[PDB]
Write a protein that binds this ligand. Sequence first.
Ligand SMILES: [Mg+2]
Ligand SMILES: [Mg+2]
Ligand SMILES: [Mg+2]
Ligand SMILES: [Mg+2]
Ligand SMILES: [Mg+2]
Ligand SMILES: [Mg+2]
Ligand SMILES: [Mg+2]
Ligand SMILES: [Mg+2]
Ligand SMILES: [Mg+2]
Ligand SMILES: [Mg+2]
Ligand SMILES: [Mg+2]
Ligand SMILES: [Mg+2]
Ligand SMILES: [Mg+2]
Ligand SMILES: [Mg+2]
Ligand SMILES: [Mg+2]
Ligand SMILES: [Mg+2]
Ligand SMILES: [Mg+2]
Ligand SMILES: [Mg+2]
Ligand SMILES: [Mg+2]
Ligand SMILES: [Mg+2]
Ligand SMILES: [Mg+2]
Ligand SMILES: [Mg+2]
Ligand SMILES: [Mg+2]
Ligand SMILES: [Mg+2]
Ligand SMILES: [Mg+2]
Ligand SMILES: [Mg+2]
Ligand SMILES: [Mg+2]
Ligand SMILES: [Mg+2]
Ligand SMILES: [Mg+2]
Ligand SMILES: [Mg+2]
Ligand SMILES: [Mg+2]
Ligand SMILES: [Mg+2]
Ligand SMILES: [Mg+2]
Ligand SMILES: [Mg+2]
Ligand SMILES: [Mg+2]
Ligand SMILES: [Mg+2]
Ligand SMILES: [Mg+2]
Ligand SMILES: [Mg+2]
Ligand SMILES: [Mg+2]
Ligand SMILES: [Mg+2]
Ligand SMILES: [Mg+2]
Lengths: 23, 26, 131, 130
Amino acid sequence: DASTKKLSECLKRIGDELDSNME
Amino acid sequence: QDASTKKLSECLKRIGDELDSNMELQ
Amino acid sequence: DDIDASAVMAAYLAREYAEAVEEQLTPRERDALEALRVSGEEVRSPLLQELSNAGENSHIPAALVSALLEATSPGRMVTAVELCAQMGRLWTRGRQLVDFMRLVYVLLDRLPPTADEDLGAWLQAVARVHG
Amino acid sequence: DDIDASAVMAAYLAREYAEAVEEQLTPRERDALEALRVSGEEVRSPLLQELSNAGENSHIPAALVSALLEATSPGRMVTAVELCAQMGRLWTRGRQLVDFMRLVYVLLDRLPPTADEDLGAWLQAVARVH
Ligand SMILES: [Mg+2]
Ligand SMILES: [Mg+2]
Ligand SMILES: [Mg+2]
Ligand SMILES: [Mg+2]
Ligand SMILES: [Mg+2]
Ligand SMILES: [Mg+2]
Ligand SMILES: [Mg+2]
Ligand SMILES: [Mg+2]
Ligand SMILES: [Mg+2]
Ligand SMILES: [Mg+2]
Ligand SMILES: [Mg+2]
Ligand SMILES: [Mg+2]
Ligand SMILES: [Mg+2]
Ligand SMILES: [Mg+2]
Ligand SMILES: [Mg+2]
Ligand SMILES: [Mg+2]
Ligand SMILES: [Mg+2]
Ligand SMILES: [Mg+2]
Ligand SMILES: [Mg+2]
Ligand SMILES: [Mg+2]
Ligand SMILES: [Mg+2]
Ligand SMILES: [Mg+2]
Ligand SMILES: [Mg+2]
Ligand SMILES: [Mg+2]
Ligand SMILES: [Mg+2]
Ligand SMILES: [Mg+2]
Ligand SMILES: [Mg+2]
Ligand SMILES: [Mg+2]
Ligand SMILES: [Mg+2]
Ligand SMILES: [Mg+2]
Ligand SMILES: [Mg+2]
Ligand SMILES: [Mg+2]
Ligand SMILES: [Mg+2]
Ligand SMILES: [Mg+2]
Ligand SMILES: [Mg+2]
Ligand SMILES: [Mg+2]
Ligand SMILES: [Mg+2]
Ligand SMILES: [Mg+2]
Ligand SMILES: [Mg+2]
Ligand SMILES: [Mg+2]
Ligand SMILES: [Mg+2]
């Protein structure tokens, strides 16, 4: 599904911000 | 073995049959 | 040393889920939960020592839950619930986590359509007796 | 038909299992569990915003968890954990109790081999901050 792909890309991006907000 | 599980299941059923009446009694 | 990540996650999700379900329980369902609590304690020791009477993964307990729910009774259904809970007590790590999810699935999947009404009147009757 | 017997059973087993696992957590793992609770609480609001953005399947959340765990960081693993925790809050009776345990299975099954040491070092850093 195209929508799911873009949704997970937004969640993967949230995950990355959580990594960067530690350092 | 599998027949041991057959026996154990009947024992838990007896416990179950007893729990059914025991908890509504007295 | 290091942590068992999967065990940390399972502990977190299990509690968060337990709190969630409890929150959404109707009042009449919350009284039954208490009744299920006490009724699970009375069957615990007879259940454990019967397990110790034989034997000493998911296959055997699942086979017992299945045998207890074979068209059944509130007492047998509650005995099945406590069996799952006791297996959860010793299934707290790794692949054991899976055996618990498969066991609980047998329980809920094999409940009879009558359970909603039969356990409603039974667990409620137990609550009045133990009051 | 006065009670959702499955929901009542799910509550009992869920709490008993929650305490059973917490009981057997080492001291170090208890620290990580509290760090995970804070980490998941920080990402919760952003997570609900993205999900609400695209608001309407049990495969969908399973697909998101899988994408988040696609070879991954501690941040994405925590986000996947909190997504499962929020689906658990929506899947609280009847036929929804099946999709939750399966969703958790996807989480644990798809974890990377290095999850233990990665999260151990990351959640410890969470403890330093908070
Ligand atoms: Mg991305
Ligand atoms: Mg964030
Ligand atoms: Mg055998
Ligand atoms: Mg025998
Ligand atoms: Mg007997
Ligand atoms: Mg009595
Ligand atoms: Mg070690
Ligand atoms: Mg070491
Ligand atoms: Mg709550
Ligand atoms: Mg409530
Ligand atoms: Mg076995
Ligand atoms: Mg197996
Ligand atoms: Mg069966
Ligand atoms: Mg029958
Ligand atoms: Mg029978
Ligand atoms: Mg009978
Ligand atoms: Mg117990
Ligand atoms: Mg293992
Ligand atoms: Mg079936
Ligand atoms: Mg079926
Ligand atoms: Mg009552
Ligand atoms: Mg009705
Ligand atoms: Mg009704
Ligand atoms: Mg009615
Ligand atoms: Mg443990
Ligand atoms: Mg242990
Ligand atoms: Mg916590
Ligand atoms: Mg939290
Ligand atoms: Mg959606
Ligand atoms: Mg829908
Ligand atoms: Mg849905
Ligand atoms: Mg599909
Ligand atoms: Mg999908
Ligand atoms: Mg890729
Ligand atoms: Mg990627
Ligand atoms: Mg990668
Ligand atoms: Mg990876
Ligand atoms: Mg179903
Ligand atoms: Mg499934
Ligand atoms: Mg692992
Ligand atoms: Mg560690």
